[PDB]
Design an enzyme around this catalytic site. Sequence first.
Site: not given
Lengths: 312, 312, 317, 317
Positions: C89, C121, C144, C176
Amino acid sequence: MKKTSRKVVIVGTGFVGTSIAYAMINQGVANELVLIDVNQEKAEGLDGMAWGEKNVSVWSGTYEECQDANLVILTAGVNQKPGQTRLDLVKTNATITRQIVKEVMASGFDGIFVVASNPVDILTYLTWQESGLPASRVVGTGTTLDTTRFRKEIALKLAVDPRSVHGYILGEHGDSEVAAWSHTTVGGKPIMEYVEKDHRLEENDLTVLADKVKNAAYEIIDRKKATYYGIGMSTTRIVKAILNNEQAVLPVSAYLNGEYGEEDIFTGVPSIVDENGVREIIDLSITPQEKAMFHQSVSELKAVLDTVRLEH
Amino acid sequence: MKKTSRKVVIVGTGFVGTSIAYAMINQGVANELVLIDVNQEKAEGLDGMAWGEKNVSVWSGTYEECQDANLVILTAGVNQKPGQTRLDLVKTNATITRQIVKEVMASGFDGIFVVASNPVDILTYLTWQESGLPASRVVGTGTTLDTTRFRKEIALKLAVDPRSVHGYILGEHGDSEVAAWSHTTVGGKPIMEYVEKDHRLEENDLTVLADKVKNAAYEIIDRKKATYYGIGMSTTRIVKAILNNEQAVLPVSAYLNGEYGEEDIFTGVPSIVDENGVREIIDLSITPQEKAMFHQSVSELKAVLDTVRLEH
Amino acid sequence: KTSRKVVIVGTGFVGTSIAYAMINQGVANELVLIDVNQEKAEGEALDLLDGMAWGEKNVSVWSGTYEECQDANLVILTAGVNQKPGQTRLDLVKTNATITRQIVKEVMASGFDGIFVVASNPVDILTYLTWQESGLPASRVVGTGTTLDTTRFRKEIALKLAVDPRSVHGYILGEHGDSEVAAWSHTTVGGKPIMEYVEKDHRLEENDLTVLADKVKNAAYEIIDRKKATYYGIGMSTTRIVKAILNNEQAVLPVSAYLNGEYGEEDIFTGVPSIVDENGVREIIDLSITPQEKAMFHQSVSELKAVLDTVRLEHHH
Amino acid sequence: KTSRKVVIVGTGFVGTSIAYAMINQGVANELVLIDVNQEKAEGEALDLLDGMAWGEKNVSVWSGTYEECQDANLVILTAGVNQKPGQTRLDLVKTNATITRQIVKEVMASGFDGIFVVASNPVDILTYLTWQESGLPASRVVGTGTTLDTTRFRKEIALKLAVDPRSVHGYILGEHGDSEVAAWSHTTVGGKPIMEYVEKDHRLEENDLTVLADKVKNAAYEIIDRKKATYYGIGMSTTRIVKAILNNEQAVLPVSAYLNGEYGEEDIFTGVPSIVDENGVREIIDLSITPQEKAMFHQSVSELKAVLDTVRLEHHH
């Protein structure tokens, strides 16, 4: 009441048995720790057990205590006296161990054997045939200690945490052991790639490493000043994986049936350890050169073993 | 082959049971951790134990698993819904827990009970009555959680490590609980001296402290956003001391028989916990004022217990 | 002196769980929690007290302001709206990029000169922006990355082969999420290449790997339960990295590291095995992955740069 | 940066055992071992390697020079001839006072400005001299005191009452040895005064206490088994204190602390419950012991001062 205790018996209360016992107590691996003093035929050496932190009841006893015991650790055996030959020392410790195992079985013991006495690979085999127990229930310390040193030394040379290093020392820990470089990785990177692609490492670097571990298998001196920490820790590591059903991969002395091209022998190879002992062996596809040295090692192992193995 | 494994069954898979299970898995306190899911008699309705660092086989099952289980943790029960009276809530959970204990016992269970359900003291007693087991084998969480908060709060106020603080909250954890200042020490120094000699603390300081813990027994909210860490840790602490036979002193819900001047009820009092459960109760010579509050707490406890205790 | 000060910015779910894990493992001596206007605070104060009360180590914890970042050794960025499954998004990225930049400006203005660890994120993107806004060396801005997914990766492999996770070594590379890459070519079990298990011993098929990889990807954004937040999830992963840093561990972690050629890519932060020590990322381990894996990696990075281009600063600090 | 550097001076039995425990508990990031001419080296190098190899934390260890003390946070003084049970012996004290001053002189010359932890014997005296020679604040010179004897004290009490050591709180006060004072008046088991177990519950008598205190006193000088050195003894006690400091623990430990009126004594370092943190000894908890105990404590101190007077410096650095 449904009881929850793990009983471990350590036969032999000399330097090795003592060191193993302290490591056991320190790590609180077992709740019941029985020490059987063998005699003047131990590793030379009561209240010295009352200091444990995470409470573990440790007491001295006899072989009868092996009935309800889950695991028995063999550590008895004498050191080579000046003059006596290596073959005569192997024979000596072979008759001591066999006698001990005979009595341990007499009590009715039906648990798991962890052999820590040297020569480990040979005594483990003698333990197996003398107890009549299944091979998977007689576990020798193999190259657990050498392997831990192997990894740390590699870690030190490349400035990384040893936990990121995976590799093994195969066979009998001594001049014949095999540094399996082909399956040694750092951060997932094959060590050979550090010499055959990055050149951040030379061929002599591996040999120096393998030799540091190789002839380190005999550096102790006066024994009264040594800590025996390595042996205590490696043996305790194996007991822990068995008692906690870790399914850990340890280079213990396992019985081979074809893996690595050898058979009918116990020796250091990567193995999965659990509640039932050794579940299976991981057969690494090592290079022809490594397999060759592994062969040399098992060959010499069998030759010496023939001088003491039982006839049935 | 002698087996070395501890089996724990957690009845109730809601917030509490889930939190206890996670703390259990995290600490590798038991090897076999079974989870019996009740129904809509818990706290919010398998796939979440895939992270156990220290290999621990977890699975959901029926009251069958309780047969060979060593310890069973009761966590079932509902929360007070709008309109329902406190008394009706007590009856609800008393009936639920009682039905559960009946099941658990029918499987042939013969281990130890650890009650984490609220009201803890009452339910611990009902569990005792229904199970028919010895009082020492039915253990409620008592004021373990409150006591840990109590010590931390004291530690924070004096800028010391909580491990250096020893004291307890006695009775039922609520507005009747008793902060036993008379036997609370910091670095071995009676907390009263910091008041009646060094004047480094005043009365109001203790009252505020005792009230923070007191008003904390009812300081939960959102539920799905709460971690239930305190309860998970408290219960796990007790289970750990039992399975490891620590002989630790915990203010668990113990059956009194005269100590503190009360009898025939389970309430929070410092007790030695081992593999057999509660071995004995430490009976502290608390002050008349503290004993009086304790009396009040036990008195109210019995009045509410009478509304659900098994008769004849 | 023995200074081990860590500041956590953002007291929402991510921020608090990172706090719970930090307290539980006692990695820092000082843990400052900064509640920002760009993030709604969650979790009761009681759960914070229980964490400290039951923590084996005595750590100082307190709510403060950006001033605390002046002498902090490490600042953990956690503010931001949660990235949900599916296609990226773009507005959520822009929202978090804005939040991140503002927060980092506040941190640098306090005189902070330590290490940044980004747990927000989209992690790779926010690490790149944190690097641009802070003006700090790339080795001192650590995301991370794929640490959590890699841990899951090894755990699933372990469960399948019924072995201890510590015996499994391998990494998930890249960003990820759905475009992440399971580096099967460099995954071993007790020293044995996972591929031999299929291309020889025939104990596993190609489909066994796919099922495994998807299990990892179909959870790269799942919201962790609060009752587990202390023992698993972003909280644990972030603490693992902070631990490796504060203890000068030299651990190999697939953090979001700045590449300069390895894996065939440059000028981006993304998941790759890196040696992490007290100065941050010392260097990146460049695995000789297969052309197929590398291709999948190139695609992940392309996706990353395309999105990064919509929020990257033109003037670095 | 995350500086956690400790230097151990003297690589004899004491020094090495402290190293083994330090490595085993991974309390320090950097562990330097300094071999001095005043102390003969002992223990195999192999045993040092196994310690590191089996230690959970990756600590960098290495043999170095005094200059390593310049940026060290803590220096552990261990050199000296072992004190054997019996009457003090002035020549041993004098030999070690000399050894201690010379070593401390070398350490300060390197530019050291951290904390000293003295584990050499006679501990109380060598801690007083270290304070004089170094010129540092008394709070920054910490002797091991009666920590080991206290651990033993509580352990024996536990065994006797069949309870867990952590439930026992109490201390051995003064100079550890035949003149140490077991403070029964402030020893509890689960919060219950040990004295009640005698003057009320009759669960044990006056002689049970004497037997127990002597047990502790009759080992206050015994040489620990090398096979146990890593787990128990001076090594562990010293590590416990070092840990309390590096982690700013605020632990209550009976270290050799500088008295200024508490317990009715002044101008000496001796064993008393003290709060230990990152700045050393923050304060002394002054327990209201009984006239009988205080009297025994007074005697212990008098003895200390008598022997201290034979080696104390006339000019403070």
